[PDB]
Enzyme design. Sequence first.
Site, PDB file in Angstrom:
ATOM      1  N   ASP A  47      -6.275  -5.105 -20.946  1.00  0.00           N
ATOM      2  CA  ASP A  47      -6.472  -6.350 -20.291  1.00  0.00           C
ATOM      3  C   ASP A  47      -7.658  -6.435 -19.322  1.00  0.00           C
ATOM      4  O   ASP A  47      -7.680  -5.679 -18.328  1.00  0.00           O
ATOM      5  CB  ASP A  47      -5.180  -6.740 -19.550  1.00  0.00           C
ATOM      6  CG  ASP A  47      -5.298  -8.164 -18.893  1.00  0.00           C
ATOM      7  OD1 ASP A  47      -5.646  -8.328 -17.662  1.00  0.00           O
ATOM      8  OD2 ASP A  47      -4.937  -9.162 -19.630  1.00  0.00           O
ATOM      9  N   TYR A  52     -13.655  -9.575 -13.362  1.00  0.00           N
ATOM     10  CA  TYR A  52     -13.390  -8.188 -12.930  1.00  0.00           C
ATOM     11  C   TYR A  52     -14.693  -7.370 -12.839  1.00  0.00           C
ATOM     12  O   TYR A  52     -14.727  -6.278 -12.239  1.00  0.00           O
ATOM     13  CB  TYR A  52     -12.431  -7.478 -13.944  1.00  0.00           C
ATOM     14  CG  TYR A  52     -11.048  -8.101 -14.014  1.00  0.00           C
ATOM     15  CD1 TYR A  52     -10.637  -9.093 -13.183  1.00  0.00           C
ATOM     16  CD2 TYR A  52     -10.102  -7.639 -14.972  1.00  0.00           C
ATOM     17  CE1 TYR A  52      -9.360  -9.638 -13.318  1.00  0.00           C
ATOM     18  CE2 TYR A  52      -8.891  -8.191 -15.134  1.00  0.00           C
ATOM     19  CZ  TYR A  52      -8.479  -9.168 -14.311  1.00  0.00           C
ATOM     20  OH  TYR A  52      -7.254  -9.641 -14.438  1.00  0.00           O
ATOM     21  N   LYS A  81     -10.814 -13.262 -20.236  1.00  0.00           N
ATOM     22  CA  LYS A  81     -10.347 -14.466 -19.538  1.00  0.00           C
ATOM     23  C   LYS A  81     -11.604 -15.228 -19.054  1.00  0.00           C
ATOM     24  O   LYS A  81     -12.595 -14.647 -18.685  1.00  0.00           O
ATOM     25  CB  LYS A  81      -9.441 -14.175 -18.319  1.00  0.00           C
ATOM     26  CG  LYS A  81      -8.310 -13.173 -18.592  1.00  0.00           C
ATOM     27  CD  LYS A  81      -7.313 -13.016 -17.476  1.00  0.00           C
ATOM     28  CE  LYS A  81      -6.309 -11.885 -17.700  1.00  0.00           C
ATOM     29  NZ  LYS A  81      -6.905 -10.575 -17.297  1.00  0.00           N
ATOM     30  N   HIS A 114      -8.147 -18.368 -17.055  1.00  0.00           N
ATOM     31  CA  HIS A 114      -7.763 -17.462 -15.992  1.00  0.00           C
ATOM     32  C   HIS A 114      -6.958 -18.062 -14.828  1.00  0.00           C
ATOM     33  O   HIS A 114      -6.057 -17.496 -14.354  1.00  0.00           O
ATOM     34  CB  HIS A 114      -9.000 -16.680 -15.532  1.00  0.00           C
ATOM     35  CG  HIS A 114      -8.702 -15.343 -14.909  1.00  0.00           C
ATOM     36  ND1 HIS A 114      -9.589 -14.371 -14.875  1.00  0.00           N
ATOM     37  CD2 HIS A 114      -7.578 -14.852 -14.308  1.00  0.00           C
ATOM     38  CE1 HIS A 114      -9.077 -13.335 -14.275  1.00  0.00           C
ATOM     39  NE2 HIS A 114      -7.849 -13.630 -13.919  1.00  0.00           N
TER      40      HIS A 114
HETATM   41  N1  LIG Z   1      -4.253 -12.957 -14.602  1.00  0.00           N
HETATM   42  C1  LIG Z   1      -4.325 -12.693 -13.281  1.00  0.00           C
HETATM   43  O1  LIG Z   1      -4.579 -13.629 -12.427  1.00  0.00           O
HETATM   44  C2  LIG Z   1      -4.131 -11.349 -12.896  1.00  0.00           C
HETATM   45  C3  LIG Z   1      -3.896 -10.981 -11.542  1.00  0.00           C
HETATM   46  C4  LIG Z   1      -3.724  -9.688 -11.108  1.00  0.00           C
HETATM   47  C5  LIG Z   1      -3.674  -8.672 -12.063  1.00  0.00           C
HETATM   48  N2  LIG Z   1      -3.966  -9.012 -13.415  1.00  0.00           N
HETATM   49  C6  LIG Z   1      -3.952  -7.969 -14.458  1.00  0.00           C
HETATM   50  O2  LIG Z   1      -2.698  -7.161 -14.350  1.00  0.00           O
HETATM   51  C7  LIG Z   1      -3.186  -5.710 -14.097  1.00  0.00           C
HETATM   52  C8  LIG Z   1      -2.174  -4.949 -13.301  1.00  0.00           C
HETATM   53  O3  LIG Z   1      -1.891  -5.653 -12.063  1.00  0.00           O
HETATM   54  P1  LIG Z   1      -2.411  -4.965 -10.707  1.00  0.00           P
HETATM   55  O4  LIG Z   1      -3.681  -4.194 -10.816  1.00  0.00           O
HETATM   56  O5  LIG Z   1      -2.059  -5.885  -9.670  1.00  0.00           O
HETATM   57  O6  LIG Z   1      -1.543  -3.610 -10.436  1.00  0.00           O
HETATM   58  P2  LIG Z   1      -0.100  -3.106 -10.987  1.00  0.00           P
HETATM   59  O7  LIG Z   1       0.018  -2.623 -12.419  1.00  0.00           O
HETATM   60  O8  LIG Z   1       1.094  -3.664 -10.299  1.00  0.00           O
HETATM   61  O9  LIG Z   1      -0.298  -1.605 -10.289  1.00  0.00           O
HETATM   62  C9  LIG Z   1      -0.286  -1.449  -8.929  1.00  0.00           C
HETATM   63  C10 LIG Z   1      -0.529  -0.012  -8.496  1.00  0.00           C
HETATM   64  O10 LIG Z   1       0.379   0.909  -9.047  1.00  0.00           O
HETATM   65  C11 LIG Z   1      -0.251   2.159  -9.129  1.00  0.00           C
HETATM   66  N3  LIG Z   1       0.480   2.836 -10.241  1.00  0.00           N
HETATM   67  C12 LIG Z   1       0.310   2.679 -11.585  1.00  0.00           C
HETATM   68  N4  LIG Z   1       1.189   3.425 -12.261  1.00  0.00           N
HETATM   69  C13 LIG Z   1       1.930   4.081 -11.335  1.00  0.00           C
HETATM   70  C14 LIG Z   1       2.968   4.968 -11.470  1.00  0.00           C
HETATM   71  N5  LIG Z   1       3.396   5.376 -12.708  1.00  0.00           N
HETATM   72  N6  LIG Z   1       3.595   5.480 -10.372  1.00  0.00           N
HETATM   73  C15 LIG Z   1       3.137   5.071  -9.121  1.00  0.00           C
HETATM   74  N7  LIG Z   1       2.066   4.147  -8.961  1.00  0.00           N
HETATM   75  C16 LIG Z   1       1.503   3.669 -10.107  1.00  0.00           C
HETATM   76  C17 LIG Z   1      -1.714   1.903  -9.408  1.00  0.00           C
HETATM   77  O11 LIG Z   1      -2.473   2.906  -8.732  1.00  0.00           O
HETATM   78  P3  LIG Z   1      -3.216   4.111  -9.415  1.00  0.00           P
HETATM   79  O12 LIG Z   1      -4.337   3.392 -10.120  1.00  0.00           O
HETATM   80  O13 LIG Z   1      -3.727   5.023  -8.380  1.00  0.00           O
HETATM   81  O14 LIG Z   1      -2.244   4.781 -10.340  1.00  0.00           O
HETATM   82  C18 LIG Z   1      -1.917   0.462  -9.011  1.00  0.00           C
HETATM   83  O15 LIG Z   1      -2.778   0.355  -8.049  1.00  0.00           O
HETATM   84  C19 LIG Z   1      -4.631  -5.852 -13.457  1.00  0.00           C
HETATM   85  O16 LIG Z   1      -5.354  -4.684 -13.535  1.00  0.00           O
HETATM   86  C20 LIG Z   1      -5.195  -6.966 -14.386  1.00  0.00           C
HETATM   87  O17 LIG Z   1      -5.545  -6.432 -15.714  1.00  0.00           O
HETATM   88  C21 LIG Z   1      -4.082 -10.297 -13.828  1.00  0.00           C
HETATM   89  C1  LIG Z   2      -3.548 -15.236  -8.066  1.00  0.00           C
HETATM   90  O1  LIG Z   2      -3.826 -14.334  -6.910  1.00  0.00           O
HETATM   91  C2  LIG Z   2      -5.032 -13.672  -7.056  1.00  0.00           C
HETATM   92  C3  LIG Z   2      -5.630 -13.217  -5.871  1.00  0.00           C
HETATM   93  C4  LIG Z   2      -6.866 -12.544  -5.911  1.00  0.00           C
HETATM   94  C5  LIG Z   2      -7.471 -12.362  -7.106  1.00  0.00           C
HETATM   95  C6  LIG Z   2      -6.899 -12.804  -8.264  1.00  0.00           C
HETATM   96  C7  LIG Z   2      -5.706 -13.445  -8.285  1.00  0.00           C
HETATM   97  C8  LIG Z   2      -7.776 -12.458  -9.238  1.00  0.00           C
HETATM   98  C9  LIG Z   2      -7.599 -12.703 -10.749  1.00  0.00           C
HETATM   99  C10 LIG Z   2      -7.095 -11.363 -11.446  1.00  0.00           C
HETATM  100  O2  LIG Z   2      -6.890 -10.309 -10.761  1.00  0.00           O
HETATM  101  O3  LIG Z   2      -6.918 -11.457 -12.670  1.00  0.00           O
HETATM  102  C11 LIG Z   2      -8.850 -11.840  -8.722  1.00  0.00           C
HETATM  103  C12 LIG Z   2     -10.049 -11.241  -9.561  1.00  0.00           C
HETATM  104  N1  LIG Z   2      -8.663 -11.768  -7.381  1.00  0.00           N
HETATM  105  C13 LIG Z   2      -9.507 -11.226  -6.463  1.00  0.00           C
HETATM  106  O4  LIG Z   2      -9.076 -10.429  -5.620  1.00  0.00           O
HETATM  107  C14 LIG Z   2     -10.895 -11.483  -6.619  1.00  0.00           C
HETATM  108  C15 LIG Z   2     -11.783 -10.432  -6.352  1.00  0.00           C
HETATM  109  C16 LIG Z   2     -13.142 -10.587  -6.546  1.00  0.00           C
HETATM  110  C17 LIG Z   2     -13.659 -11.789  -7.026  1.00  0.00           C
HETATM  111 CL1  LIG Z   2     -15.442 -11.884  -7.232  1.00  0.00          CL
HETATM  112  C18 LIG Z   2     -12.795 -12.858  -7.320  1.00  0.00           C
HETATM  113  C19 LIG Z   2     -11.415 -12.703  -7.134  1.00  0.00           C
END
Ligand SMILES: NC(=O)c1ccc[n+]([C@@H]2O[C@H](COP(=O)([O-])OP(=O)(O)OC[C@H]3O[C@@H](n4cnc5c(N)ncnc54)[C@H](OP(=O)(O)O)[C@@H]3O)[C@@H](O)[C@H]2O)c1
Ligand SMILES: COc1ccc2c(c1)c(CC(=O)O)c(C)n2C(=O)c1ccc(Cl)cc1
EC number: 1.1.1.-
Length: 316
Positions: A47, A52, A81, A114
């Site tokens: 993803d 990003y 996205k 997005h």
């Molecule tokens: N569509 C949107 O608006 C949107 C928003 C936010 C996120 N996203 C997507 O969803 C993805 C995941 O969400 P997110 O980055 O917020 O984080 P998330 O998967 O909830 O992970 C949070 C933290 O957990 C740690 N972690 C991972 N596996 C672990 C494990 N097995 N045991 C303990 N800690 C663990 C990671 O650190 P380490 O890296 O050090 O392991 C990471 O920083 C993003 O990377 C992105 O692709 C989409």
């Molecule tokens: C819905 O609440 C959030 C809050 C913060 C967020 C996002 C979503 C996303 C979307 C996602 O993570 O998919 C991004 C990328 N956020 C950032 O912190 C960010 C960082 C740098 C830039 Cl230049 C623009 C946004």
Amino acid sequence: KYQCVKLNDGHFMPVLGFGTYAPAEVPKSKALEAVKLAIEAGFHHIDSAHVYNNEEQVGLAIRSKIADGSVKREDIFYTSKLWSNSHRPELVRPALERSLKNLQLDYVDLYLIHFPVSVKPGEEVIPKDENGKILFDTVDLCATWEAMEKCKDAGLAKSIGVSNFNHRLLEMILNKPGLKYKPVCNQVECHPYFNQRKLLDFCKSKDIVLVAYSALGSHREEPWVDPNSPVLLEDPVLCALAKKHKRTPALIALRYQLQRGVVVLAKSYNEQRIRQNVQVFEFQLTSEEMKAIDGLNRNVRYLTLDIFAGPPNYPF
Ligand SMILES: NC(=O)c1ccc[n+]([C@@H]2O[C@H](COP(=O)([O-])OP(=O)(O)OC[C@H]3O[C@@H](n4cnc5c(N)ncnc54)[C@H](OP(=O)(O)O)[C@@H]3O)[C@@H](O)[C@H]2O)c1
Ligand SMILES: COc1ccc2c(c1)c(CC(=O)O)c(C)n2C(=O)c1ccc(Cl)cc1
């Protein structure tokens, strides 16, 4: 072989996706190494997003594991996205083509809108005026969806969906006169402290898959996440269930999603934890364990993007 779900356009999505977003101060090089490790561990769903700023690296990882014979392009499901500076219909395809150019892939598996609030066109992802005000834009998201539909017909996106949409905004698309392709998914925040039951039920009723981000309780990155929010993975019920299964709270939180019919993302740039996360296919939770995790729910939304609050399309 690996576990996938049929989407409403007949394409298939692997049910465990690798998240690639890291805060800006983590060097972009680490995205390249983590994606390769993810592929090696058995992730078949990756993803990313324009915003990003890692599509060069994540695309390189992918092209690298294809070229070295580890995986075929058909067994990688790559999501990009559409960022809010390219909502205007005529800017949709060019944004997808820019992403594809940066990735050096021919197509994306999935292209999502997005975030439903629009901003002014141009190179800047968060355009501001001289006084630091965000430059919001006024775009009809139904037209943006039509342009998304065309990218699918061009074969540049095998499937199209949405992210951070609410009930009203989904309905807006679903009821569009002349609608040609439903969103295959709605990628939203989803975890045991914010379980999205209502929105989940709604998407099921329209055969839209809910894709869970921040399933482990988020990157926790300030200022986007309040440092006083409780740490999901420190939960005593999740830690007790981990302990009992000789697993980890992470794995419990991911398994919970798979079993309720949610596709779940998990980010990690740590080799050990990347490999740990694929163990979510090695165990199961009983009905009583699932109901236990249900009871954790508390309306803790970690991520609000409230710099984009104010316009009518702000979803939360
Ligand atoms: N569509 C949107 O608006 C949107 C928003 C936010 C996120 N996203 C997507 O969803 C993805 C995941 O969400 P997110 O980055 O917020 O984080 P998330 O998967 O909830 O992970 C949070 C933290 O957990 C740690 N972690 C991972 N596996 C672990 C494990 N097995 N045991 C303990 N800690 C663990 C990671 O650190 P380490 O890296 O050090 O392991 C990471 O920083 C993003 O990377 C992105 O692709 C989409
Ligand atoms: C819905 O609440 C959030 C809050 C913060 C967020 C996002 C979503 C996303 C979307 C996602 O993570 O998919 C991004 C990328 N956020 C950032 O912190 C960010 C960082 C740098 C830039 Cl230049 C623009 C946004």
